[PDB]
Design a protein around this ligand. Structure first.
Ligand SMILES: [Fe+3]
Length: 53
């Protein structure tokens, strides 16, 4: 799945992960550590929304 940062528009793509910030490709959004933040704007996990209906 993909999740958008509601603040800045960064897309957390589970297939990409976020390796520069310690997250291997394939990591689901729920599994990101509680203190992971948007790598662009620093928003907390609460500010992301899943891109699905
Ligand atoms: Fe952001």
């Amino acid at each position: 799945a993909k999740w958008v940062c509601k603040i800045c528009g960064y897309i957390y793509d589970e297939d990409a992960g976020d390796p520069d910030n310690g997250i291997s490709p394939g990591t689901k959004f729920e599994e990101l550590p509680d203190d992971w933040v948007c790598p662009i704007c620093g928003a907390p996990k609460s500010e992301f929304e899943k891109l699905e209906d």
